[PDB]
């Protein structure tokens, strides 16, 4: 990660803390947590930002929208190929994924240029140090 | 442009105002002008951000480092193919490109993930 805001968020991240990565259409609140990386349609791609962020975090659990199973199987598969078998995948309603953007332990909401549906994820941090 | 900060900057832009796009290594001051889009090495690319921004701005002139001609002939060529022939290309020393990051009429410094040398540009706005 060369992103400053992201490195800053990851530096304030400890056990139970959340970090999200979202597609272009996700209604992300306009606060300090907001990290807009979007350039244009599909730039950068959700999966590329995800792969990059995983390299700099110890994750415990991830959250995905139940709707991803049916509406974006390809993205679900790409996510599974990325994370290790050790990490637990929890599905919740997309509506909940939206609420979590304002979770008290949410340390950042990254916006990508992704346009495929339900390309959103929440990363829950394990013990840092 | 779907980028919120870029959109904001381009909203406050008028004649003579500047907007810059830089590679990952350019020392961009830590102020309100700074817009960090860098994800990782070469993501996003300089050329892709430039192409996007050009679609949203009326530009009069661009500034490039004189050093680009010899150290990155490829990037110079890509830039030329992107802008019209009615836009003037002014070459200045890289050192000055750096000083322009704090120009009084500079409305935004965009940081990309570009890693190739002298991939930096300054766009001067025409009448809005």
Q: Which chain B residue shows the shortest CA-CA distance from A50?
A: B39
Nearest to B2 among A3, A48, A113 (CB): A113
Radius of gyration of chain A (CA): 13
Q: Is B23 flagged in the annotation as binding? A: yes
Say whether A50 sits in a helix, a strand or coil.
Answer: helix
CA torsion sign, B18 to B54 to B20 to B75? negative
Q: Is A36 flagged in the annotation as binding? A: no
Sorted by sequence, the CB contacts under 8 Å of residue B81 that are 6+ apart come out as: none
- Cis ω before A44 (30° cut-off from 0): yes
DSSP category for residue B117: T
Backbone angles phi, psi at A15, to 5 degrees: -45, 135
Burial A21-47 (b: 16+ CB within 10 A, else e): bbbbebebeeeebbbbbbbbebbbbbb
* Neighboring chain A residues of B5 at a CB cutoff of 8 Å: 36
- Asked if A121 and A82 touch (Cβ cutoff 8 Å), the reply is no
> Contact B39/A2, CB-based, under 8 Å?
yes
List the domain boundaries for chain A: 3-126
* Catalytic-residue membership of A15: yes
Among residues B82, B30, B78, the alpha carbon closest in space to that of B59 is found at B82
| Separation of alpha carbons A121 and B31, rounded Å | 30
Q: B15, B32, B71, B103: which is the annotated catalytic residue?
A: B15
How were these coordinates obtained?
A: X-ray
Q: Which of residues 18-47 of A touch B (CB under 8 A)?
A: 24, 34, 36-41, 43-44
- Asked if A40 and A112 touch (Cβ cutoff 8 Å), the reply is no
Backbone angles phi, psi at A109, to 5 degrees: -120, 105
- Asked if A39 and A73 touch (Cβ cutoff 8 Å), the reply is no
| Separation of alpha carbons A67 and A64, rounded Å | 8
Q: CATH fold of A3-126, please?
A: RbsD-like fold (3.40.1650)
| Separation of alpha carbons B36 and B24, rounded Å | 9
């Amino acid at each position: 990660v060369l992103n400053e805001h992201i490195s800053k968020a990851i530096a304030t991240i400890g056990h139970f803390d959340l970090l999200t990565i979202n597609d272009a259409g996700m209604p992300i609140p306009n606060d300090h947590r907001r990290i807009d990386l979007a350039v244009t349609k599909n730039l950068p791609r959700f999966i590329d930002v995800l792969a990059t962020v995983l390299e700099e975090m110890e994750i415990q659990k991830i959250y995905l929208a139940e709707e991803i199973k049916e509406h974006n199987p390809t993205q679900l598969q790409q996510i599974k190929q990325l994370i290790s078998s050790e990490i637990e995948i929890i599905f919740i309603p997309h509506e909940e994924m939206k609420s979590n953007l304002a979770h008290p332990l949410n340390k950042g909401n990254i916006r990508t240029g992704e346009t495929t549906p339900y390309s959103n994820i929440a990363l829950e941090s394990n013990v840092t140090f």
